[PDB]
Design an enzyme around this catalytic site. Structure first.
Site, PDB file in Angstrom:
ATOM      1  N   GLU A   1      18.950  84.923 117.305  1.00 46.43           N
ATOM      2  CA  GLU A   1      20.024  84.012 117.690  1.00 46.43           C
ATOM      3  C   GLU A   1      19.456  82.794 118.405  1.00 46.43           C
ATOM      4  O   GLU A   1      19.953  81.674 118.237  1.00 46.43           O
ATOM      5  CB  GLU A   1      21.062  84.718 118.560  1.00 46.43           C
ATOM      6  CG  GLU A   1      21.715  85.947 117.926  1.00 46.43           C
ATOM      7  CD  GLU A   1      22.646  85.658 116.744  1.00 46.43           C
ATOM      8  OE1 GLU A   1      22.719  84.506 116.267  1.00 46.43           O
ATOM      9  OE2 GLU A   1      23.320  86.603 116.288  1.00 46.43           O
ATOM     10  N   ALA A   2      18.395  82.995 119.194  1.00 48.67           N
ATOM     11  CA  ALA A   2      17.739  81.872 119.855  1.00 48.67           C
ATOM     12  C   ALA A   2      17.153  80.911 118.830  1.00 48.67           C
ATOM     13  O   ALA A   2      17.227  79.690 118.995  1.00 48.67           O
ATOM     14  CB  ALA A   2      16.649  82.392 120.785  1.00 48.67           C
TER      15      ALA A   2
END
Length: 246
Positions: free
Chosen positions: A161-162
């Protein structure tokens, strides 16, 4: 080779890791926004990459990532590896082929991970200590499926997600810089829940306007309608899922 070490990690070392991951994942640009490769024209030998997550020179794991969606499909500890129940069939032909490969009993969706963890994303702390603890747990080989699922919730958000979202990589950076763990806020959760929808809106946009509107949530739990390429929140996308060419 893409490595992140938790030993003395800094805002900068984490940022450089996410930057390297994004550079390896990018398949092109659409409307100036990086997009992952189209799976239908991607050679399978180019589909899976590894990241090494280490606590020290002697304690590390690898995680296998599908470049078509940036999603974690497997992890490896020494001679043993573990694949998400919904890993693509080809993943085990390219990742960790020199290990004894096992199938995990849960899917990689947040729905199944949260079910097995008996905790939602909002309840699970993220940050350097959570990641350190998770690396140790996977390297130890402990069989606790509840903790396996929780650990993957941590890794998926701090890595995948980062990589996808500038908002999320920055929030993890801040956590490392301050030494303060955090629980994902409502905006982070909504980004995770709408990655494919935002990617589709950008790529299907006509005259900068999405055909399918996307409803996000801001930090204050306010619903935000995103229907335009020019909406401020669109800028948070660092990598899009491939949906369609313009």
């Amino acid at each position: 080779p893409i490595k992140f070490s938790t030993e003395g990690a800094t805002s900068q070392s984490y940022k450089q890791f996410i930057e390297a991951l994004r550079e390896r994942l990018r398949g092109g640009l659409i409307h100036d926004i990086p997009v992952l490769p189209d799976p239908t024209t991607l050679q399978e030998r180019n589909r899976y990459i590894t990241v090494e997550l280490s606590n020290s020179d002697t304690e590390s794991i690898e995680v296998g990532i599908d470049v078509t969606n940036a999603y974690v499909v497997a992890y490896r500890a020494g001679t043993q590896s573990h694949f998400l129940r919904d890993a693509p069939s080809s993943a085990s032909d390219y990742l960790f082929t020199g290990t004894d490969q096992h199938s995990l009993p849960f899917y990689g969706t947040y729905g199944d991970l949260e079910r097995w963890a008996h905790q939602s994303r909002q309840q699970i702390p993220l940050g350097l200590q959570a990641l350190t603890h998770g690396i140790s747990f996977f390297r130890s080989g402990g069989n606790d499926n509840e903790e396996k699922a929780r650990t993957l919730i941590v890794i998926i958000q701090m890595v995948a997600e980062a990589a996808r979202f500038r908002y999320i990589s920055n929030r993890v950076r801040v956590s490392i810089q301050t030494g303060t763990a955090f629980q994902p806020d409502a905006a982070m959760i909504s980004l995770e829940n709408n990655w494919d929808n935002l990617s589709r809106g950008v790529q299907e946009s006509v005259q900068d306007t999405f055909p399918n509107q996307v409803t996000l949530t801001n930090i204050r739990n306010e619903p935000v309608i995103v229907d335009s390429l020019s909406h401020p929140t669109v800028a948070v996308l660092a990598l899009m899922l491939f949906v369609c060419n313009p």
